[PDB]
């Protein structure tokens, strides 16, 4: 997909008539193949899997921030005639299906966020995470990233993992491009997301958190929210992965 093209890439299914688009959205290193195993089971749906700036097919896609991120992400619907969607979106997507849901997306149903930060509390909080992040650019712009997220993976939001659920995460995270996955982690920082709470708690939309039973982290964050939260039993920050039947469960609870 061309470095200029305005609308993102994402593999398109189509359902039945009458019902909304299920538009996915992945986390940091991942693409549109993420929640492929969990959204085919929701095949009376028409489901859009989205590849984010820098990841997957929208890889030669630069962002500086949000704005560009939304922006595209829009035209991206308005490419498919998309009218009627929910968005589904994990840790990074999910921030990014906030981010874009709070300044105005015409035609949205509601936004299913499994593991994704609502902000920072203040601007010391944030500074530290622009440290944080400078840190992990930097790794992604001089490492093999197999080695970078050997690293990445051991970070205490993926305590819960195994090595062998690591091992097969950081061999699947390094069919990536170090130089625009730091593009796409400094352009969408956490350091650079306002606090979100005050929008969701004034939120014309229909809001759903979804959170993994071993995700302390953000089951803590989930529980500020005014939003239902629905905790998947065995499963870590990324429960659609180690528990799909458990997440196509909570989907059926919100969708159906
Ligand atoms: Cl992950
Ligand atoms: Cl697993």
């Known amino acids: 997909v061309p470095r200029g ?3 993102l890439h994402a593999q398109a299914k189509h359902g039945k008539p009458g019902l909304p688009w299920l538009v996915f959205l992945h986390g940091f290193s991942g693409d549109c193949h993420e929640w492929q195993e969990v959204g085919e089971a929701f095949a009376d749906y028409s489901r859009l899997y989205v590849d984010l700036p820098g990841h997957g097919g929208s890889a030669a896609i630069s962002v500086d921030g949000f704005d560009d991120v939304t922006d595209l992400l829009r035209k991206t619907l308005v490419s498919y005639n998309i009218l009627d969607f929910w968005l589904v979106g994990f840790s990074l997507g999910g921030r990014v299906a906030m981010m874009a849901a709070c300044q105005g997306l015409a035609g949205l149903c509601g936004v299913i966020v499994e593991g994704g930060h609502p902000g920072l509390q203040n601007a010391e909080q944030r500074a530290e995470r622009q440290r944080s992040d ?30 062998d659920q690591r091992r097969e995460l950081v061999a699947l995270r390094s069919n990536n491009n170090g130089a625009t996955l730091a593009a796409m982690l400094e352009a969408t920082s956490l350091a650079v997301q306002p606090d979100l709470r005050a929008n969701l708690s004034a939120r014309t939309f229909a809001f759903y958190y ?37 997440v196509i469960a909570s989907l059926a609870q919100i969708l159906r």
């Not at 992604?140 to 939001?157: I, K």
């Not at 995700?215 to 803590?220: E, H, M, P, T, V």
Request: aromatic share 10%.
């Open 134 to 163: 400078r840190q992990w650019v930097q790794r992604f712009l001089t490492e093999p990233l197999t080695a970078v997220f050997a690293d990445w993976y051991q970070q205490p939001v993926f305590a819960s993992l195994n090595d």
């Open 210 to 246: 979804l959170c993994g039973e071993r995700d302390s982290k953000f089951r803590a964050l989930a529980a500020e929210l005014a939003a239902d939260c629905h905790v998947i039993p065995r499963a870590g920050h990324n429960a659609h992965r180690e528990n799909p039947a458990g």
């Open 5 to 7: 093209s305005m609308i």
